[PDB]
């Protein structure tokens, strides 16, 4: 099973965790592995709000903010509300070998800044 990279840089409660079903708040930023940014919340001037754990999102975020819908991985650590972290995403748990063009490309990696603002 594929994991996304998951670095925490600020830790949040460690008590309030997301589960599949739930709906969270986040602020973040998408970047590509050379720098160039590809998506933020700040671009949409408003913190993004979905459903986690149902495919609303790419694998990858799914899998991060759900800590592997339950059942948690190896070197997979868990995001609390509050919580700073940076997800490195791998092609298939993103937009796979076709990806989106001209969007994000063929085979793309992102590199995702998020923070967890809210649980429902």
Known sequence: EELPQIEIVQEGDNT???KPGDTVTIHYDGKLTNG???DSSRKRGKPFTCTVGVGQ???GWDISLTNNY???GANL???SKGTKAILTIPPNLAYGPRGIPPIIGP???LVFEVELLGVN
Do not use: L
């Open 107 to 109: 085979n793309e990696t």
């Open 77 to 79: 650590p868990k995001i």
């Open 16 to 18: 309030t965790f997301a």
């Open 57 to 59: 999102v790419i694998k």
């Open 70 to 72: 339950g059942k948690g």
């Open 36 to 38: 160039k940014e590809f």
